[PDB]
């Protein structure tokens, strides 16, 4: 932060001479001097250059063309406007947040002006930074307390060993001096929630529209386990979603509760929809409680909003129909449903306080924002017993937290505040919609097959596309209107290979081959499997990383139409088995795999397996107690009929749980076992595309085994 801008040139000498005198004075205090051209030149030095903090221009030249466009971006940006004798303000400059510093063109006084710019810049630093981060930067330059934790104390112990000096010179002196414990008085403690830590929680909840938000220092997986230890006593009933995360599986194995699983909608491509509106009715909640033995009235409900693919629900209908006093929204993928008007009434934090209910959200911090790892937030909207919920937070968080992550967790809430931060959310949406239009433009004009985006036929608007009932792009049979939404920044590329009715085609390329092709250039696919490709277009993906994705997609069509070899295209796959992948081309591998999907029938064995629910004998908590004693055995794949499993089957593809730990596969859940036996055959002929199921272990013959309980 040391860029000073000097716009325009009056042509006279009594105004340009102080500019040259100030040019030699600002460089003595480490400041970069730039000279833009016209008015459009200065506007490009703010959005593309965020390290600017000084704009010098004539007040009697552009008093209305500069004080309006700059205020729409950065309001607290200092403006070093130089006024004259006959200078005045304007009536249209009253409702604009600006910082104008008036000066003169006095000769010889350039030294006093340089001291005022440095002091004004320091005021901008001490304003946009939160008090928790301000105390961390000041403690390094002044706080020098001896005999404290950790033992390195800013890297002193690393300077006494040759191997330790290599680890200290990598980061920096300010990095090691920022990792301190709770042994500081002027910074407070995280567990005590006082001092700088008290005002830090009020600054995040106010910007994100919440009552009180915490800062979990153990990732999002830990924040999901703290919620379950509150609204689920030893012997209650919860309403957990079927499409749950691995962290939510261990939550059901630690609390003696009876969870109820829902049946979300799904299609043939593997993209799971959402929970229908009929499951939130009062006649549906009490329906599964009376059927399942040992189950009381549900007091907690876990709703995955949004899902892993990015599909927002309708919180305006859930907060009124669903009669649950503790409704949870797993918002671990949309931490921006506030800084845009096209997201009002779509999340739990949008609106007001529901009478008699509370909203819990575990928004991820180190996923689609800008902070260090092991960071999360817990949004609470209601008047409940927060003291009981806080008891579960200290049981998982150590007494000496890492302030380097806490300083970055709150920074993510400060980088989005104001118009300067809102441009990153709207900018990511504009870059996402532009990328969606480039696919349809390069599809019809091209000569042959091309990728397709899972989007409606009309994408001219800039909002969330609803999933209506008279459309064919979503492919969800019997879907509720005004319930399922679409995330614009979650572009889902549909590779050719299937029709629009749900059947199979003749010419197509699976998404598994394209997934490994993008890794050669440096692009990691988020989700892949059947015929879908998921990507993340957050604030971290600028215009460079967004346009480079389209160039790699056009190279796949060129290498496939010209019929190239595998060695001269995929060097990583060739090193796995050079003998088998010798005389094989890109067209021979793409056609052989496509015939195996039609032969083994993948869409039918997948839509019917994940639809039905296996018979749950005991609670997931009882399955963990049997493993602690040592009564876990394993059988063959064709012998697990009628046995209680102990692990969660997470087959790739897709990416959702199949059998929960503590369920039995009988005669009703026959297609469930058929989906596991189909993947064992299709992923054994060609190397590289082996079967990946978090639960099925590979042996030496090809048959997979699962862990069950002893009879």
């Amino acid at each position: 932060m040391n860029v000073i801008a000097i716009l325009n040139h009056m042509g006279v000498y009594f105004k340009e001479e102080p500019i040259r005198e100030l040019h030699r004075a600002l460089e003595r205090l480490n400041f970069q001097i730039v000279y833009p051209n016209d008015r459009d030149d200065l506007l490009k030095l703010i959005e593309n250059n965020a390290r600017l903090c000084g704009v010098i221009f004539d007040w009697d030249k552009y008093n209305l063309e500069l004080c309006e466009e700059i205020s729409k971006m950065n309001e607290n940006l200092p403006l070093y406007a130089f006024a004259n004798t006959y200078s005045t303000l304007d009536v249209s400059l009253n409702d604009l947040r600006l910082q104008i510093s008036f000066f003169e063109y006095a000769l010889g006084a350039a030294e006093d002006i340089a001291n005022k710019i440095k002091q004004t810049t320091d005021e901008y630093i001490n304003t946009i930074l939160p008090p928790l981060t301000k105390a961390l930067f000041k403690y390094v330059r002044e706080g020098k307390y001896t005999f404290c934790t950790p033992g390195h104390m800013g890297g002193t112990a690393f300077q006494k060993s040759p191997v330790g000096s290599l680890f200290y010179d990598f980061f920096g002196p300010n990095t090691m001096k920022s990792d301190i414990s709770i042994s500081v008085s002027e910074l407070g403690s995280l567990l005590d929630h006082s001092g700088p830590h008290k005002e830090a929680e009020q600054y995040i909840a106010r910007v994100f529209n919440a009552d009180r938000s915490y800062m979990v220092t153990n990732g999002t997986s830990t924040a999901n386990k703290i919620v379950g230890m509150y609204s689920a006593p030893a012997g209650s009933t919860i309403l957990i979603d079927r499409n749950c995360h691995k962290s939510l599986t261990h939550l059901m194995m630690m609390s003696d509760v009876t969870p109820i699983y829902f049946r979300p909608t799904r299609n043939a491509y593997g993209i799971l929809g959402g929970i229908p509106q009929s499951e939130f009715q009062h006649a549906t909640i009490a329906k599964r409680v009376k059927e399942t033995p040992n189950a009381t009235w549900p007091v907690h409900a876990v709703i995955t909003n949004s899902t892993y693919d990015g599909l927002l629900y309708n919180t305006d209908f859930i907060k009124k129909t669903l009669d649950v006093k503790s409704i949870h929204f797993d918002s671990a993928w949309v931490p921006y449903t506030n800084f845009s008007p096209i997201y009002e009434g779509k999340c739990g934090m949008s609106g007001g306080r529901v009478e008699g209910k509370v909203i819990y959200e575990t928004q991820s911090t180190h996923k689609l924002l800008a902070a260090f790892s092991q960071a999360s937030m817990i949004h609470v909207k209601g008047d409940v017993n927060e003291e009981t919920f806080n008891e579960a937070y200290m049981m998982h968080t150590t007494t000496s937290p890492h302030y380097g992550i806490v300083a970055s967790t709150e920074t993510a809430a400060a980088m989005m505040k104001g118009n300067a931060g809102k441009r990153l959310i709207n900018g990511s949406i504009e870059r996402a919609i532009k990328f969606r239009k480039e696919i349809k433009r390069l599809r019809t004009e091209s000569d042959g097959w091309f990728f397709d985006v899972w989007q409606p036929d009309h994408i001219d608007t800039t909002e969330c596309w609803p999933l209506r009932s008279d459309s064919t792009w979503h492919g969800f049979k019997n879907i509720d209107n005004e319930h399922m939404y679409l995330d614009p920044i979650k572009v889902t590329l549909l590779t050719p290979g299937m029709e629009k009715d749900g059947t199979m085609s003749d010419f197509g390329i699976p998404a598994s081959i394209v997934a490994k092709y993008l890794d050669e250039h440096g692009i990691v696919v988020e989700k892949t499997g059947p015929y879908n490709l998921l990507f993340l277009f957050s604030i971290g993906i600028d215009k460079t990383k967004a346009l480079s994705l389209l160039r790699a997609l056009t190279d796949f069509k060129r290498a496939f139409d010209l019929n190239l070899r595998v060695k001269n295209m995929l060097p990583s796959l060739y090193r796995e088995d050079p003998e088998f992948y010798e005389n094989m081309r890109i067209q021979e591998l793409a056609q052989n795999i496509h015939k195996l999907i039609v032969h083994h029938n993948l869409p039918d064995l997948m839509y019917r397996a994940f639809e039905v629910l296996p018979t749950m004998v005991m609670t997931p908590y009882a399955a963990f107690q049997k493993e602690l004693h040592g009564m876990t055995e394993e059988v063959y794949l064709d012998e697990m009929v009628g046995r209680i499993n102990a692990n969660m089957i997470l087959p790739y593809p897709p990416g959702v749980p199949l059998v929960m730990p503590g369920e039995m596969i009988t005669e009703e859940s026959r297609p469930v076992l058929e989906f596991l036996q189909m993947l064992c055959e299709i992923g054994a002929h060609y190397p590289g595309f082996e079967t990946d199921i978090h639960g099925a272990y590979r042996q030496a013959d090809g048959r997979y085994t699962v862990k069950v309980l002893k009879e």
Binding site: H193, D211, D383, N385, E386, E387, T388, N390, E391
Partner: protein, 194 residues
Amino acid sequence: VLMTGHAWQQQGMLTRLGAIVQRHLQLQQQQSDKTALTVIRLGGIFSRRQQYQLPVNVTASTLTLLLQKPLKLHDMEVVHISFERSALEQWLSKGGEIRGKLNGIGFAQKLNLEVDSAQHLVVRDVSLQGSTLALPGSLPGEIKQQLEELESDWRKQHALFSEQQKCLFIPGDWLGRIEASLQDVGAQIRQAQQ
């Protein structure tokens, strides 16, 4: 209800005991500066600074709270405000608004009660005036003299029932409810003298 209310002066002594309590509370609020009302902070980290009343020292459901400087609430004076125990723990833990009656009569009207920095209860009115609440501690000579006159009336009415109960024309099931009604009045008058 008549035989267990105004027969042997069951309710007749209830409306007379209130005049003694009203006179007793008038002398206790004058010397309320000796024993104040310190509110303790309950354990646990909460958003709003929750408060908690005294534990075993107070166990009544409809306890009374005194005050030092009187205020003009609802265009009338008051010397003691009673709060419900089942409603005091909810407002001090979840916030919101509290409802309490005045002078032990009327409906539970809304008051402008807040928390004090010295761990007390400040009652605000229409003029933004402070008033620290207090509780009566654990007997004046004037109150004891008037209380023994009312307590002696209960023994005179009980002595009449313990002499004419041998009437053969009176059914036996009625004697089981008359004795239970006389002990309820006697058990209440023995509480204020503690």
